[PDB]
Every structure is written in structure tokens, then in C-alpha cells.
Amino acid sequence: GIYAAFDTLMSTAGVDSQIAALAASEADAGTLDAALTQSLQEAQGRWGLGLHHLRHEARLTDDGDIEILTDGRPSARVSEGFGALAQAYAPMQALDERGLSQWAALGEGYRAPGDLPLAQLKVLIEHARDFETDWSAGRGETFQRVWRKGDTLFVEVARPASAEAALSKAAWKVIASIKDRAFQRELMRRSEKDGMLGALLGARHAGAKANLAQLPEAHFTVQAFVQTLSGAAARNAEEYRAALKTAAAALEEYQGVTTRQLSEVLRHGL
């Protein structure tokens, strides 16, 4: 179907959209469009595209399609495929040498550097109104950044990985667990000319590489996590560190679940 296809897309970010069920349960377009939007926004925070400065909408067209839009302008439709959506987002983002977004989550306006001490940041969390920090190296290969808009502060934690890199990570895991050592050697010697992901796909049925490209996992993967704090907690420094630890461990589990899901896909792929 088409609503289920949008769901498989949201699953690549760890979002339980369940639009196929809502689209079934009769329903007004407003609930559909509203639920589609709330799903697409939640997915943007984890894909690591770096488009927080944009308004993300998902609407149900009179075609029967699902139109995904940025700043009110149509990006692609779900019926176009997920490569069209990734290629739609592609010119909209600017990524540095680490795969981190060069854009600012609050738009243009000064944002502090990553060299900022936690004490100077502590007063920004407690006595500034709107502020943003650049990317600073997080705890263990991870990266992080913080910003507040209005009465809500946002902490983002990112371990940048492309969809191809996420699949190669799970391709290593699959080959590492083949009980047949003979097949294992065969896959390892062909990994020189084809790579780990290419060697595994070559030893599947002839259409696996093509079937893989049609899945949303081929172009979208969990790259970051966003934790929100509101009310008085948004100005609490200790509460901020508590949310930072909560988010980095949430990203690690989501990135861990993705590898397990991809492993069972590289073993069986329609």
C-alpha cells in the first residue's frame, strides 16, 4: 500500500507512525494530515538531515498519495519512492566533514561555539532567552549541540552514519555469524572486489540489490536524537545534563535496533 509505505519510512527513524491503521479507521483528513505531520517532524529529529530551520508538513493528496513538504513547498510524494524524498532533501542540507549539519536550528543569528565551557553555557541555560551552540564533540565518538526556542530547550545528540554505512555495519554482523565457515571465507574473499555489503548481496538472489534500493532503509537511517525540556525544567542546568544523558543513550539503542533490523533484512529480502 501507500500509507504502509510511509510507515516503513517512519520506522527507519524509530517512529511508530501507524498511519496504515489510521487511514483504515475511516477518519477526517485533518487527523490524517495532523498525524502525518507530527510523525514526519519526529522523524526529522532522528534522521540527522539538519533541517530544524524548516517547517515539515505531510498531507494526504486528492490523488491518494502522501505529499511531504518543506516550508509549505512540495518536496516529493510517497508514491515517488524514498530515493526521490532523499534526493529532494539533499540540496536543502549542508553537511560538514563529519556528516553534521552546518545549518543552525534557530536560523540566522549568532550561536555560541563548541569551545564554550559548561559554566558559560550554564548561564546561557539559566538566564538567556534564545541561544544556540555549535557542534561540540560529545561523550565517545558522539556529538552534541543545544538550543532554546521560546519556553522549550532542545538538546541534540548525533552519531553520524549514512544509510549505506548503517547497512555495511549490519552486513559485517551477518557475515560474522555465518556458521558455514566455507561460505564465510567465500564471502570474505569476494569482499575485496565488492565490499562486505556487496559480497553478501551477490550471494543472495539476483534481485536483492535492486529490492534493497526500494526499501526506505536504503536512504534513511537513525543519525541523531532530540530531547525536549519545557516549563521550568527548560531553565534547569542539572535537568539539562539529565536530558543529555537520556538522549545519547536513546540514540545508541535506536542505532542498535536499526542494525538488528537491517541484519534480518540482509538475510531475507523480498
Add this chain to the structure above:
Amino acid sequence: DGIYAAFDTLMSTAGVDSQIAALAASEADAGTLDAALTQSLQEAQGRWGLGLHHLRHEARLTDDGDIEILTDGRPSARVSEGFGALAQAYAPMQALDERGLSQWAALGEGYRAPGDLPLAQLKVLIEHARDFETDWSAGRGETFQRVWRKGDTLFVEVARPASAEAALSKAAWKVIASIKDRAFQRELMRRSEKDGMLGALLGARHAGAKANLAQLPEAHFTVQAFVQTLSGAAARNAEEYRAALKTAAAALEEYQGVTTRQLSEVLRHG
């Protein structure tokens, strides 16, 4: 003794040389006049200490031959109605503490850091935040100070609250104290026991002296603060902020100092 001259003497009570009487004779178009009038009223508002920066102050020449004073678009008073009427119009809009400082946040609804704040935490807000505002903090001598930034401009207000009636009694004392005829000076100090310093010098009771000077702008508006502004990179340099705080307190002492001199000239006659 015209109407444009009436505004000039009103701006003269804030140390603002509007030169509206010349610009009126200048055969300048009305748009330039309204701009000169409006920008002058804003300059005076920062020095009158009414604490109405959260309002949009506006002045415009009526097609009636008068000039109208607006706040947030609604007309408050017209200059031909008397300077007390404008003071009476502003007064209900003001929220003043027991020290004479506005409790109004200059930036509106939001977070306001306390005057308790250490200068150390202030320096971070100057350099790494965007929009911020502090409350009232005790400054050099008996003055008070606050600081805020809206967009690309930084605002430094240092104030020493003194009512218009309080400035009159102080100038009335400076003239009474300077009286060389011990016999005449003793007479005024005898009247001041009941009628006060201003009532004694005017040979009346207190409220009678207030009624004598009713149409005088100096009897309704004085200078209680000074606003120094920085824009651009200087608005983010804490070394240049500190410099602006001193320039504002120096101009406050100067502008507060010439109003008691000018007032002595007014009171010395009768």
C-alpha cells in the same frame, strides 16, 4: 511662544535639542517633521525614567495645527493640552517600585535575569546569548542600572530616580541656601517649616507653588535615567559594554546636573 517651540521646551526637559521650531520654519515636508518629532520623543523617553520602553512612542503633527503624542498607536495627549496632561497621561501607564524605578520589563513578556547577577554571568550573556534582559541592580553611588539587548542593539540604562516635584524642592533649596541676607534667608527657612522648600521660596504653600509652575514643563518632566546603545560587534563585546555603562553614568550626572542649574534660574525670580 508658538506650538513647535512648546515641544522644543518639552524636549529641553530631557536634554534633547529637537530644533522642531526651526524645522517647522524650514518648509520641510510633513513626513520629515513627524520623523523628527517621533525620534525626539523616543530619545526623551529614555531619559525621563518613566520606564515605558515596552511601548511604541509616537508623535505626529495633527492637521488641526496641534501635535499628537501616541503610545502603541493610541493617542495619550496632545501638546496644546498642557505638559501636565501628558504627564497625567503617562502616569497610569507606569509601574514604579518604592525606589522610583520601572518594574516593567523593557523587552516584554519573557525571562528577566535578576539584578543579583554576578558580572561574570553577565559577560556570557553579552557574548554568547541573543536576547536577554536584567532587572534593576544597584550601581555606582546611589544610581541603579539595568541592561538588555533586542536583536543587534544593546541597551544600557543607568538611573537615579528623582521626581519632578523632588527636583523643584532641591533647586528651591539651592537658591534659598545661597541667600546672603541672613534676615531674608531666615524668613524663607521659617516658611519652609510648614510650606516646604519650594512653597517657602515662592512665598506660598506647597500646593500653591505647584499651581504657579503648572504650565512649566520642568514641573512635570525631569531626567532620571540615561540610555546608552551599542549595535553590531560592539554590542557583543563585554569590554565595550563596560565602557558604555560609564559613559551613561557620566551623561546622567551631566544631564541631571544641568537640570538643577536650569531650574535654579527658573525659581530664582519670584
Add this chain to the structure above:
Amino acid sequence: GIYAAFDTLMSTAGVDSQIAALAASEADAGTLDAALTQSLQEAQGRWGLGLHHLRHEARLTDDGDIEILTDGRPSARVSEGFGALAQAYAPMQALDERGLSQWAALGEGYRAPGDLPLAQLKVLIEHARDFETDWSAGRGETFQRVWRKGDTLFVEVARPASAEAALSKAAWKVIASIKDRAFQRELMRRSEKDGMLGALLGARHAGAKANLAQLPEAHFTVQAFVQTLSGAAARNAEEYRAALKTAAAALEEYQGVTTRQLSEVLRHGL
């Protein structure tokens, strides 16, 4: 000077800026910037550039220059010359085959065509909130359009003419009045290879063509007029026609005064 140069620029739109005098009369930057802005906006309505959808600012730089900006972005400085300002505006405008702006004064959003009857427009003037009309052919080679933003309606009347076309119109008038018929014939036979404006300039001193290019009249001319109606009059249909007739005759006089000014410039050009 530099402030006088901005004034000569405003004179090309029929605006009495008088900034050289204000810049002399001491003054705060805010009055300068505010007066500069109010002047530049009034001039945009008559130059016929078609940039109503833009925010026009003019500020005094710390250089001593005058910075003209569009939507908050610097376009050019007065010290750069007027060709730089015209070339700055040039890529910002879209003009049709008649020299009329293809942009909308209210931005994107539906606007009615020029084929709209006055009766259908009458209800738009009386019961719509925000509306705009496309260019319709006005009364006698003239063009017109109407729109309302908020509590203010705007009627624009335009006789499109480039600065070169305005100068050639005044070049015809100068040659048509030469008492020396011999010189007249001489200028007319050279008008075949050089044109009317080129022939007259050739018979002046050798540096007139270069001196002409440095004047603001070489790149800016009165092309339209804008009449504003506010309050209850903004919704009055008869008052709208009264303003339309007021504006088209204002443009005709302004275009008539320009030709007279240019005639006395082509006769004498420093």
C-alpha cells in the same frame, strides 16, 4: 558633499528630502536614519521600480556614507554613485513589455486582473480586507493599479519612462527652442547619426556626456505616483476615484516639472 548628493537623488523623484540641512543641524543618527528612510520610501513610490514588496532603509554609516538597503540587506552606498544604486536595484525588479512592474505590491497571493469591472472592484474596495489588482490601462496612455494592506489602500498611477527617455524628451524641447535656426538645422542633421540627446550633448563642451552620467537624473526619473487613503476613507468607493484623479494629475505635473528641470540641465551642465 554626500548628504547633498542623496538630496539630488531624491529630487529626481520630486521629494524634498533636505538631508544636507538636517545633517548640518547637529542631530542624532536616529533622526537622520529615520528621515533618510522616510525619504527613500517616498522616492520608491515615484521612481516606478516596482519594489513595494521590499523594505527600503537608508542609514548613515560610520564611514560618513549613506547606506541604502533592501529587506535589511545593503544595496549600495551613496558614495558609490547613482549608477551603482540603479544597477543594485536592477536585478531586483521584473518589468513587462510596457515598463510596468511584474511584481505584486502585496507579495504572493491572488490578485485580480485588469479586466475587472469597476462594479466588481467597488465591492472589493468596500467589503474585502486585503486585495490587489493587476495593471489596467489608465486614462490616456497612463496605467493604474489598486491594493489595500491593513487599514490603508493604495492607488498607483504610472506613465513608464526610462531616465534616458525622459532626457530625450527634454532634449527635444531644448532644440525646439533654439532661436538660431542655423544651429537648429546643424543639430537636426546630426540627430540622424547621434540622436536628439546625443546631438545636443555633442555640441556642448567635450565633457558634458560624462558629466551627465554622474547626475542622478541619468538613472532615476519620476515614473509613477502613489496616493494613500486611510481610515474610513480607505473603504469609500467615491473617495477612491477622487484619489485616482488626484494622483494621475500629480504624476503629470511631476513628469512635467522633470522635463523643465532636465531642459535647464541640457543647456548648462557643470
Add this chain to the structure above:
Amino acid sequence: DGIYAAFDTLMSTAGVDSQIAALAASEADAGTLDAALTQSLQEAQGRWGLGLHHLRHEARLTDDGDIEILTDGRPSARVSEGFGALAQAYAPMQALDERGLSQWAALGEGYRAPGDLPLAQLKVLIEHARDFETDWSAGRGETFQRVWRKGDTLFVEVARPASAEAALSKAAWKVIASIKDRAFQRELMRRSEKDGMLGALLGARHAGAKANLAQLPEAHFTVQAFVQTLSGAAARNAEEYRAALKTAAAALEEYQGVTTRQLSEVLRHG
């Protein structure tokens, strides 16, 4: 004070004696004039340091009585429009680093050896290669140098970047520093504290001085480089290359040296 004389003074700012005014009076055919004009503009381009050698610079006499300046076939500006307009026309085409040198490769798209290169590796490219180009490398003193070859001709450009405005302030200092009346010299140095070296000498602010000299070619074009060329067997002799590098730096010091002398004559009057 004609138009051909206007080009000659424009070429005089690059040390190029075009003698176009004489060639115009010479009753020479237009093809010879366009050739003299075009080849002169190319000579000046190598010394202006605009770094536009990847472009085809062209000049031709319009049938309008003007002369038109082309780059890659498209018209950039016409000489009667003012020398700033030509500077303003070239400026967006330039790509300049923080040192004032063109980042543009003189040969276009291809490989460019770095300025890091040892002279040893350069000698092989001189003797055994065909087409090659080096980047910018620090040369004798504070100058910079690059070298390239296209076909049978070798190009040696040595540059010391200095803007036109920077050359004016330097000449304004040389005249101010030479003032013998200690009283007058002290006055100019007091103005230079705010208005700068050029503004102080002209009795104005900085932007006012820029506006005074607007129509002067020396205010928009100076010499920042020199190009020395070898063709034939000398273009493959590293011993003759080294000789050309010195001849170019000697002519750079000479041509840069006479522009500050000539500029002192210009500034000394007012």
C-alpha cells in the same frame, strides 16, 4: 577633456601609454583604433591585479560616440559611464583571497601546482612540460608571485596587492607627513583619528573624501601586479625565466612607485 582622453587617463592608472587621443586625431581607420584600444586594455589588466586573465578582455569604439569594454564578449561597462562603473562591473567577476590575490586560475579548469612547489620541481615544468600553472607563492619581500604557460608563451606575474582606496590613504599620509607647519600638521592628524588619513587631508570624513575623488580613475584602479612574458626558446629556458621574475618585480616596484608619486600630486591641492 574628451572621451579618447578619458580612456588615456584610465590606461595611465596602469602605467600604459595608450595614446588613443592622438590615434583618434590620426584619422586612422576604426579597425586600428579598436586594436589599439583592445590591446591596451589587456596590458592594463595584467597590472591592475584584478586577476581576470581567464577572461577575454575587449574594447571597441561604439558607433554611439562612446567606447565599450567587453569581457568574454559580453559588455561590462562603457567608458562614458564613469570609471567606478567599470570597477563596479569588474568587482563581482573577481574572486579575491584575504591577501588580495586572485583565486582564479589564469589557465582555467585543470590542474594547478601549489605555491609550495620547490624551484627545483619548477625548473622541470619550465623545460620539459607544455601547459602548466602554479598557485600564489610568497616572493621577494612582501610581494607574491605565480607563473604559467599557455602554448608558446610563458607568463610571470609578481604582485603586491594594494586596493585603490588603500593607495589613496598611503599617498594622503605621505603628504600629511611632509607638512612643515607643525600647527597645520597637528590639525590633520587630529582629524585622521576619526576620519582617517584621506578624510583628514581633504577636510572631510572618509566617505566624503571617496565622493570627492569619485570621477578620478586613480580612485578606482591602481597597479598591484606586473606580467612579464617570454615566447619561443626563452620560454623554455629556466635561466631566462629567473631573469624575467626579477624584471617583473623591478617594474612592479617602479610602476607601483610612480603611482604614489602621481597620487601625491593629485591629493596635495585640496
